[PDB]
Design an enzyme around this catalytic site. Structure first.
Site, PDB file in Angstrom:
ATOM      1  N   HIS A 112       0.885  -1.336   0.035  1.00  0.00           N
ATOM      2  CA  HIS A 112      -0.201   0.077  -0.017  1.00  0.00           C
ATOM      3  C   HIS A 112       0.959   1.275   0.097  1.00  0.00           C
ATOM      4  O   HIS A 112       0.508   2.330  -0.021  1.00  0.00           O
ATOM      5  CB  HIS A 112      -1.243   0.113   0.985  1.00  0.00           C
ATOM      6  CG  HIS A 112      -0.525   0.326   2.651  1.00  0.00           C
ATOM      7  ND1 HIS A 112      -0.857  -0.593   3.645  1.00  0.00           N
ATOM      8  CD2 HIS A 112       0.003   1.406   3.053  1.00  0.00           C
ATOM      9  CE1 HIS A 112      -0.174  -0.249   4.607  1.00  0.00           C
ATOM     10  NE2 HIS A 112       0.144   1.119   4.331  1.00  0.00           N
TER      11      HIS A 112
ATOM     12  N   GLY B  75       2.396   6.410   9.875  1.00  0.00           N
ATOM     13  CA  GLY B  75       3.837   6.107   9.423  1.00  0.00           C
ATOM     14  C   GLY B  75       4.500   5.022  10.129  1.00  0.00           C
ATOM     15  O   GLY B  75       5.591   4.418   9.572  1.00  0.00           O
TER      16      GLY B  75
ATOM     17  N   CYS C  30       3.471   2.123   9.747  1.00  0.00           N
ATOM     18  CA  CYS C  30       3.172   0.981   8.810  1.00  0.00           C
ATOM     19  C   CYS C  30       4.552   0.474   8.510  1.00  0.00           C
ATOM     20  O   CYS C  30       5.687   1.100   8.297  1.00  0.00           O
ATOM     21  CB  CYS C  30       2.427   1.340   7.636  1.00  0.00           C
ATOM     22  SG  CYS C  30       0.800   2.102   7.927  1.00  0.00           S
TER      23      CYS C  30
END
Ligand SMILES: O=C1N[C@]2(C[C@H](C3CCC3)C2)C(=O)N1c1cncc2ccccc12
Ligand SMILES: O=C1N[C@]2(C[C@H](C3CCC3)C2)C(=O)N1c1cncc2ccccc12
Lengths: 301, 301
Positions: free
Chosen positions: B41, B143, B145
């Site tokens: 993503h 962030g 992630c």
């Protein structure tokens, strides 16, 4: 979102942990530059722990008696001194993994990360707080001694704690890196009183702000209160008195939540008087006091 | 003595965290050998998150579109593929800090350490559990992630988790390192149901053994019970059914405490039926289910 007792990343401190042997006794040491730091009770035989004369024990010891291992590599001890309750062993090699660092004496209520070690190998990392009575509630086994506590500001490791003792009551006492005990403790095997532990009130308020920020708002009530009225209730429940310093450092959290400190204090008053009633806050059925307002802001930033 | 939610030392994983940029989007990646792993993503613009075609988005992308930074040093991307929900970026440089490692798919109820990162910099480490409904209750901001979860067996890092999403409900979903989601989740911005979370019964029993071992014994009662009778009570309270596998892995803790599993089960039954009554166990007013019997044995060893 979410809220966890988070430790600082331990990498910078892993590369500093060494094994220190003196006779039968092995514990952990901290290798910075050309000095290794450890608890001085490494020179004690179990039969001297009642009342050791550390000078007199150290006097029957020369450099070669100290076995400093970093993984496989042995280090060579070319000088030894005793600073309060720590041994400084001067070795031939500068630690190539030495991070930028300072030594800091923390204050009761402040938090730090602990790297729990055995035989100079890191086993685990957890977050904890200098209790008001200068004990810590850690997780330490035989040989954990010399395990260090630290904060990380950017690239700078601040070492604040070296572990020396478990007390007869199951809690943990240790020194700053200059070898001065936190609290009234000595490195002798006698029964020592911790004293009354209180709750770190400013930390409990930071945690409440943390909860509001993460959607848990049920404890928010209509009331407000006074610094005086609040502290009256605080003392009844063995909470530390709250000062204008405390109100001031809660400002950023006030500002972010649009809740005045004293309205948060009023929510706390009611929780103290009424208990939690079976409800929970950030997954806890108990008031948490081991996050500082700094810790809450860092994690929420 | 003492008992803490302890994480594995994070050093070995710090030296693997990199920053990955693709257009405006930045998140963390895991640099092992000559491959960087991150959530796919990273190729989405906020306007594609409702229903992205990841193939079609990846197709409008070449190697040079991927900005992989390790501290200061840029890396050169000489190959890219998409494996389920992760991007594998092949780079020119082998990571010199690559530890020994495996990729493992963990089971619900198992625990791991999380290194929470932002812009490829490590910020914090905490211990947590794959919930039965394959969510985790972490501490993740925008962030975070690509932040990874891991276990350390000796010198061997087992990576089990990569963080992809916070769900509308505030909990956290992610993949193994081959890019397969834990649970029924997809990497789309839709409302997704977690399902009913249950308590990890075997873990709650391990924690009770941990408490006995650390002097907290008040919950020990005169009764015993049956695996059947116990599981009847378990289901009422959304506890996972206990199996003979569970009884078997509690053996070492049975052996060390001299308390039979089913007598411990009977103590648990009563706590479930009567609550804690205002008492605490290892400083908690709630039944803890995020230590495995392995975690308890490690910390107690
Ligand atoms: O390994 C030692 N040795 C001393 C230091 C010794 C005292 C100081 C001079 C007499 C006794 C100790 O306090 N411990 C432990 C530390 N931390 C957790 C433990 C858990 C269980 C047993 C001992 C522990
Ligand atoms: O940074 C992102 N971006 C996505 C991934 C995006 C989804 C998957 C395709 C649509 C949306 C996300 O879930 N988050 C966050 C992750 N973890 C904690 C957060 C906390 C606050 C906000 C966003 C978080």
């Amino acid at each position: 979102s979410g809220f966890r007792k988070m430790a600082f990343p331990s990498g910078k401190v892993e590369g500093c942990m060494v094994q220190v042997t003196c006779g039968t006794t092995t514990l952990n040491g901290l290798w910075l530059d050309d000095v290794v730091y450890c608890p001085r009770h490494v020179i004690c035989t179990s039969e001297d722990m009642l009342n050791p004369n550390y000078e007199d024990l150290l006097i029957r010891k020369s450099n070669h008696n100290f076995l400093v291992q970093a993984g496989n590599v042995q280090l060579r001890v070319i000088g030894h001194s005793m600073q309060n309750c720590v041994l400084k062993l001067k070795v031939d090699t500068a630690n190539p993994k030495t991070p930028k660092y300072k030594f800091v004496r923390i204050q009761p209520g402040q938090t730090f990360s602990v790297l729990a070690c055995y035989n100079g190998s890191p086993s685990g990392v957890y977050q904890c707080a200098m209790r008001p009575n200068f004990t810590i509630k850690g997780s330490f086994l035989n040989g954990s001694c010399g395990s260090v506590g630290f904060n990380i500001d950017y690239d700078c490791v601040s070492f604040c704690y070296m572990h020396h003792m478990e007390l007869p009551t199951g809690v943990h006492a240790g020194t700053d890196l200059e070898g001065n005990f936190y609290g009234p403790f000595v490195d002798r095997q006698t029964a020592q009183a911790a004293g009354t532990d209180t709750t770190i009130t400013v930390n409990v308020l930071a945690w409440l702000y943390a909860a509001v920020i993460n959607g848990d708002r049920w404890f928010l009530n209509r009331f407000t209160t006074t610094l005086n009225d609040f502290n009256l209730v605080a003392m009844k429940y063995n909470y530390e008195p709250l000062t204008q310093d405390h109100v001031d450092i809660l400002g950023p959290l006030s500002a972010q939540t649009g809740i005045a400190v004293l309205d948060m204090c009023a929510s706390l008053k009611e929780l103290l008087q009424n208990g939690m009633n079976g409800r929970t806050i950030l997954g806890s059925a108990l008031l948490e006091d081991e996050f500082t307002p700094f810790d809450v802001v860092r994690q929420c930033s």
